[PDB]
Symmetry: D2
Subunit: 397 residues, 4 copies
């Protein structure tokens, strides 16, 4: 039996240190979850699991899906969990949920993600047994993660950014093209804001006293202003092109959806948007992580009996413009194809709040697939440490 | 298609601050995984995913399955990830693994868990935007997490331990009953050591000599000796029963297995031990978290068309002896059922290296099933925060 | 032989988190020491000690007088040190300097204080040997310090603020009296800026932001300060609802440094210095910690006794206003008429100026000495309450 | 009028993480002060200030002299304070006390030092306004201090060790000579213990109950050969390295107290003055060469006294590293006989270097020894981290 997605939602996405800084990852999750149930009218006891992608957990919220369910006020009956496959964790939660559903184990579950990058921890592995002989190192969680993902044999001191630079180098990607992609990202996000489509996606968030519905970071952005910015690794390398302007930031948000059967959705009065056709996962070289989408997509299209040409709409994460352009090069893109890809924006304009990112992409794909009455959508992303995840979704009718 | 478990293995289990103190979770993970690949002769490129239960993640190892896979020398083409459902994380990884294999997405994966409780971080959320007004707090990851898992509306100040005391009060479990259970646990584990069954389970770990034996189990453990210990929260409850002796510790370990189809195992020369029949999960009151196996087992058995009496072997996590005993009251157990339960030992004697516990149970359950030529096994655990997880396994007869 | 104070100076005084937040205590001291030397023309090697009052030391600068000297470009042959007597530390450094000069041991020394409250450390004693058993605590240096000063037998959980309320209560001082005093303080301070007397005291500070700019003015003082506005403000009330002490009527937390030269009249003459005052006597006392604000009364008593002097003998007083109530209590005990307020804290005080602890004694010295000259008065008194139950007072004579 | 020292005393000195690990600096200070008062019968209202050398102060004890008086049950009328001049802070407290006294300002004061190196805080300056951009460092107070004492134009990444290796290089001091000095230091210290003289100095400390009277570090067995076996701390980077844990002083816990007064006031109280302070000197040296600071400092003090080094019966020189002390002794043109009159009851190497309390320890030995000997002149001198020296000359009272 099929697995279908209903009411995929998100909060607004805040900047690191910005709008949502007073809010925990849990507060955002709850807000997204309350909104999901509130829009749906679903009885709390209908939810059989809450599965949440969450990339920077600590003991403030163990097994974060369960904490988020309780905090949202669902009954003690409702189980929950946390998953991490990096930048792909949101999609992963979704995939797990569909698997749990299709099997016939569960009829309805929640799949989501939450990240508060603003409030990620600083930690020490030196204070337990003492620093009397070694000193004390305290690591920023965001910063350390950037270099450790590849493990011991594939270190990257320059982190995520260094991977993109490698890509720009390997594909001869001009700075201009990169800045250009970014503009589109902003124009599209902004266009979406004012065309009213975004309200469909968003649960507004109350901050102790006002309520927020608009994503903080999308902006007036021109190729000319972007040309001005100084790349991060210019001193390390003089041919750098990656800047804050052409790359996604660090952000706060949550994403929620319902994963259910068509039969169950009909009973609960729900309106399913897509069903999951297939998915694929891949490993790639960690220093080349930005390319993980290509092998993963290939696997997914094959499982689907599908071709990329067959595909109506694409959500490809814009971790770095350079990274995205490289996948698009491999996909042999034509100026039209940029029509069907990232239509409402992406990481660069929106933000990249890592756990919630897969959800955001889904909310946009599925809903947009509806608005267009289009058949197939692709969701795919690169993963820090050398991974890729992709999923194929089909509109319901 | 079926999902079957092949070659389920673990490292030995170190004590907190003990023999594996110098080892990261990743190091244990890598050793378990390498051992598994070595024992099986499997080409590395065969492994389509590595899913790992891991309950205290930090930035030293993001998405830990992937890191363990790289650090073990597997090719860059192999994906990996991290899962947390607390004390149920190892089972959860296995279940996810079966779902992926069964759907026909993957033909072979590794499921496992790793934990180093010895090296769990201390952490703060006050150092990034300033402690100017708040003050700064640094939290022990192990301690802080025992309290918060229930969230804001279900706080447990006493921790996992209070919940255990809660069950002891409700179900009227005596001190003697608990200590007694602890004794069996040590005797069964030690006996498992002497009988040589353990070697089949264990990946030896080199430390800078080589270790093949679990640290915690003690031959001389007696009831009279256990009676001497001071219950942890005597000060607060004079009726407290739960001591270090009758509860599990904090531990270091790793677990890995192969999850595969029967046709794929045949092709590769594997010996599949069990196939997964069903699972169930449940939520319970967070202050009563120890009872979680009862509803979960209920769900798993019923999906299986099975009854508790149908079950040949049970592994139930002994998080606390009062917690385990309470589950047994619901199950209406008797001295005889005690001979089909936790037969090689448990969390009390063995220790509770949390992301890897599900893995350790599975290794025993699967192997003991094969040793007994019995049919059905149940693996179930209580989960901090108020959860239960259960699975029913069937011996592969071939 | 006499000891005289030459060219007493200070930086501007910054608010906690404000102007100088990017500056260390060392940075401020160095700017002051350099300013002192630039003004004097003194060769660096004339300096035989740098003694600094510094109340929140850590290992960023051990023995901070030595570090401040080296960092200011003084030769390696110059010794330096750190002293702590809390709110009294700056004066204490002056007195030590004076004694080492008077004994004939040293001919010229530098006496000072530096404090950056903005940058005070957070610290833990649970980090060295393991946190598994106890938990790990980190303390804000500033906050923890308000309770510990009395030791175990006399903890004051309230802090300095509580000891002030204790004084209000004992001496029956209305919130009105307290609030009026604060007004004068801002008024005397502001007046002193426009009058231009402050430039004499101040070494200007450069801060790098768009450009690097130089600061000459104290952050905190306000002209617009009125009793009425001060009533709008909430005592620090839940605890005692007869609470009268607000952020408005007490000193805050601050960043500044102070320096001066201590020398013989004969040496000052050789080097072309203009000695302003000489030290006549000093006194120190202990009082109950929960009553710390009153410490000046006993210390002052002892100093005048040693001087053979009386309070009427005193033309100028600088009494630190840690709290308006604290200052008022001292003044009653001194039997102060309305006119005596004429000669006390004429250029402002802690409430308007701020209270950067190690540098405070230096700041007051700078006013008393210069004002004594501008006035052509004879005798000045410097005195302060000290956290933990102490007082320090000194008498100076214009030269 | 003169300033004289009466009843100089100390606690025993314990090792880093040792016997006194559960005691604060204040605790040691209180015991020492209490013992001093118990011994002398001094009326608590006779003490006009308590001046304490304290090197690693924190908010646990502000103005530590005042806290110590209070905690030791002195009346609230008694003021107190803290001073730091590194390794010279204890002597610096004495010189201050003597100056306040000779002045006529006070008739009687207490001067001391207290250090608990065990409990020195770890700190950050990144927490207050946040590390959101910069990161967070936490510094060990001991290790961090060793690099910063010279300031930004003279950093010593090597710490005090690097200064000591700089001295052995410059002065060419062999490893054997360094080890020989260390051996003498242990032998002299142990001898002082057999002989019974040490009791004269020591205030026994109670810990929770057992009472401690003996310094922790000194060992009778120490030999050159055993010492040769140790490895120089800085060998990786210097092939010629000599300085080791064996021939350097450790990190230590202790307190020192004494009475400073005039002869007239001492006559009144029926006190027994031991020495009077003749002179003192202070000096600045290069921070990379800090160990040599005694040489210019001794020169100043001897000169002020109209005195010569030949005139000095007894010397207490801090043995911070054997190499540093040996270097000073070279400048001083010492011959075999000189070792006869220097550090006669042990030193920093055997006893320990509890930094705030070190000036007090040396004084207690010197004043007391000078009396037993019936000798006239004594010298106390130490090197100070960051590039300083302090020396004082003391003369036996008749």
């Amino acid at each position: 039996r099929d697995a279908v997605i209903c009411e995929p939602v998100r909060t607004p996405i805040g900047r690191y240190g910005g709008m949502f800084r007073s809010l925990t990852a849990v507060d955002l999750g709850v807000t997204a979850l309350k909104g999901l149930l509130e829009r749906t009218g679903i009885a709390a006891d209908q939810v059989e699991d809450v599965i949440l992608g969450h990339c920077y957990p600590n003991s403030e919220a163990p097994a974060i899906g369960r904490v988020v369910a309780l905090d949202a006020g669902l009954p003690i009956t409702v189980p929950g969990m946390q998953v991490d496959r990096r930048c792909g964790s949101g999609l992963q939660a979704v995939i797990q949920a569909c698997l749990q559903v299709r099997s016939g184990d569960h009829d309805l579950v929640v799949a989501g993600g939450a990240e508060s990058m603003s409030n990620v921890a600083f930690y020490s592995t030196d204070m337990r047994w003492g620093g009397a002989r070694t000193g004390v190192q305290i690591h920023d969680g965001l910063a350390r993660g950037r270099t450790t993902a590849g493990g011991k044999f594939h270190p990257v001191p320059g982190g995520m950014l260094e991977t993109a630079e490698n890509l720009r180098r390997e594909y001869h990607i001009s700075r201009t093209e990169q800045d250009e992609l970014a503009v589109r990202s902003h124009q599209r996000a902004v266009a979406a804001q004012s065309e009213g489509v975004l309200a469909e996606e968003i649960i507004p968030v109350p901050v102790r006293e006002e309520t927020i519905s608009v994503d903080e970071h999308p902006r007036d952005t021109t190729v000319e202003a972007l040309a001005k910015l100084k790349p991060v690794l210019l001193k390390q390398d003089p041919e750098a092109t990656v800047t804050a302007g052409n790359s996604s930031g660090q952000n706060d948000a949550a994403s929620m959806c319902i994963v259910t059967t068509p039969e169950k959705a009909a009973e609960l009065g729900l309106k399913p948007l897509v069903r999951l056709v297939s998915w694929g996962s891949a490993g790639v070289a960690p220093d080349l992580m930005g390319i993980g989408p290509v092998p993963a997509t290939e696997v997914a299209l094959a499982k689907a009996g599908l071709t990329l040409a067959d595909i109506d709409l694409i959500e490809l994460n814009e971790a770095f413009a350079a990274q995205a352009l490289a996948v698009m090069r491999e996909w042999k893109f034509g100026e039209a194809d940029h029509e069907r890809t990232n239509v409402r924006g992406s990481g660069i304009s929106l933000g990249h709040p890592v756990g919630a990112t897969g959800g955001r992409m889904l909310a946009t794909l599925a809903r947009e697939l509806h608005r267009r009455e289009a058949r197939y959508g692709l969701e795919t992303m690169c993963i820090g440490g050398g991974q890729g995840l992709a999923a194929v979704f089909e509109r319901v009718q």
